[PDB]
Amino acid sequence: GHMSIFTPTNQIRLTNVAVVRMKRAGKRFEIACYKNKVVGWRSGVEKDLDEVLQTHSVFVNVSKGQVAKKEDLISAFGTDDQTEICKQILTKGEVQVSDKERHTQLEQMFRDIATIVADKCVNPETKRPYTVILIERAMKDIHYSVKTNKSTKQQALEVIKQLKEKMKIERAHMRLRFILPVNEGKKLKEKLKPLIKVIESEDYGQQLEIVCLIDPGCFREIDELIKKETKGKGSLEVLNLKDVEEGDEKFE
């Protein structure tokens, strides 16, 4: 980065690779995957785990220039499958968690995650939730560099508590499900579905239970239509039990 100007976008090219490497106790494993949200697979935001692999060559040490072939990885790691090795390097290595700016802890990248958490929380009387700086000031205060190696499905509870530790936010993003019969269901299902604001939790039996709820920051933008689309038709129930049958997540 910040060296060559010629950087054309392509699917499988060494010009579109992301730097990621795993540091072992007595060995190094540096690889190159697609820069298109390479860490997406660790959160279920990917499309596959094949095309994301730009190169099948792993470096044992870029300083010396030791390129490990299929025989090398089979000896060093013990497996001939690069997918397994690369997968480990991606979840236990120095992966570029850059979603926008292709740099480290700079370029205001700390404000990026702050923008996502902003709409997810409600601030008390002082300004509107659009003030990313307001939440960012408290976010980076308790835990600096919250974007660096941010473990999504692992430190989810920690991150939300770290924020509350400093600034006590008012509620957060919850889940609600509407309950109405087939007759009334055949009205909101043709309005809320095309908008694509629903969650993978619906009922297709006698009651069309639909779980639709976005970030509280934009609650006024979603409820403005929900108030008449389903609220002024069926009953609105809250979804707080994740240890029970939610409904249907697939028609198969």
Swiss-Prot record:
<dbReference type="GO" id="GO:0001833">
    <property type="term" value="P:inner cell mass cell proliferation"/>
</dbReference>
<dbReference type="GO" id="GO:0043022">
    <property type="term" value="F:ribosome binding"/>
</dbReference>
<dbReference type="InterPro" id="IPR018978">
    <property type="entry name" value="SDO1/SBDS_central"/>
</dbReference>
<dbReference type="InterPro" id="IPR036786">
    <property type="entry name" value="Ribosome_mat_SBDS_N_sf"/>
</dbReference>
<protein>
    <recommendedName>
        <fullName>Ribosome maturation protein SBDS</fullName>
    </recommendedName>
</protein>
<dbReference type="GO" id="GO:0003723">
    <property type="term" value="F:RNA binding"/>
</dbReference>
<dbReference type="InterPro" id="IPR002140">
    <property type="entry name" value="Sdo1/SBDS"/>
</dbReference>
<dbReference type="GO" id="GO:0030595">
    <property type="term" value="P:leukocyte chemotaxis"/>
</dbReference>
<dbReference type="GO" id="GO:0005634">
    <property type="term" value="C:nucleus"/>
</dbReference>
<dbReference type="GO" id="GO:0007052">
    <property type="term" value="P:mitotic spindle organization"/>
</dbReference>
<keyword id="KW-0007">Acetylation</keyword>
<comment type="similarity">
    <text>Belongs to the SDO1/SBDS family.</text>
</comment>
<dbReference type="GO" id="GO:0006364">
    <property type="term" value="P:rRNA processing"/>
</dbReference>
<comment type="subunit">
    <text>Associates with the 60S ribosomal subunit. Interacts with NPM1, RPA1 and PRKDC. May interact with NIP7. Found in a complex consisting of the 60S ribosomal subunit, SBDS and EFL1. Interacts with EFL1. Interacts with CLN3.</text>
</comment>
<dbReference type="GO" id="GO:0030282">
    <property type="term" value="P:bone mineralization"/>
</dbReference>
<dbReference type="GO" id="GO:0002244">
    <property type="term" value="P:hematopoietic progenitor cell differentiation"/>
</dbReference>
<keyword id="KW-0206">Cytoskeleton</keyword>
<dbReference type="Pfam" id="PF09377">
    <property type="entry name" value="SBDS_domain_II"/>
</dbReference>
<feature type="modified residue" description="N-acetylserine">
    <location>
        <position position="4"/>
    </location>
</feature>
<dbReference type="GO" id="GO:0048539">
    <property type="term" value="P:bone marrow development"/>
</dbReference>
<dbReference type="GO" id="GO:0000922">
    <property type="term" value="C:spindle pole"/>
</dbReference>
<keyword id="KW-0539">Nucleus</keyword>
<dbReference type="GO" id="GO:0019843">
    <property type="term" value="F:rRNA binding"/>
</dbReference>
<keyword id="KW-0963">Cytoplasm</keyword>
<dbReference type="GO" id="GO:0005730">
    <property type="term" value="C:nucleolus"/>
</dbReference>
<dbReference type="InterPro" id="IPR019783">
    <property type="entry name" value="SDO1/SBDS_N"/>
</dbReference>
<dbReference type="InterPro" id="IPR018023">
    <property type="entry name" value="Ribosome_mat_SBDS_CS"/>
</dbReference>
<dbReference type="Pfam" id="PF01172">
    <property type="entry name" value="SBDS_N"/>
</dbReference>
<dbReference type="GO" id="GO:0005737">
    <property type="term" value="C:cytoplasm"/>
</dbReference>
<dbReference type="GO" id="GO:0008017">
    <property type="term" value="F:microtubule binding"/>
</dbReference>
<dbReference type="InterPro" id="IPR046928">
    <property type="entry name" value="SDO1/SBDS_C"/>
</dbReference>
<dbReference type="InterPro" id="IPR039100">
    <property type="entry name" value="Sdo1/SBDS-like"/>
</dbReference>
<keyword id="KW-0690">Ribosome biogenesis</keyword>
<dbReference type="GO" id="GO:0042256">
    <property type="term" value="P:cytosolic ribosome assembly"/>
</dbReference>
<dbReference type="GO" id="GO:0005654">
    <property type="term" value="C:nucleoplasm"/>
</dbReference>
<dbReference type="InterPro" id="IPR037188">
    <property type="entry name" value="Sdo1/SBDS_central_sf"/>
</dbReference>
<comment type="function">
    <text>Required for the assembly of mature ribosomes and ribosome biogenesis. Together with EFL1, triggers the GTP-dependent release of EIF6 from 60S pre-ribosomes in the cytoplasm, thereby activating ribosomes for translation competence by allowing 80S ribosome assembly and facilitating EIF6 recycling to the nucleus, where it is required for 60S rRNA processing and nuclear export. Required for normal levels of protein synthesis. May play a role in cellular stress resistance. May play a role in cellular response to DNA damage. May play a role in cell proliferation.</text>
</comment>
<dbReference type="GO" id="GO:0005829">
    <property type="term" value="C:cytosol"/>
</dbReference>
<dbReference type="Pfam" id="PF20268">
    <property type="entry name" value="SBDS_C"/>
</dbReference>
<keyword id="KW-0225">Disease variant</keyword>
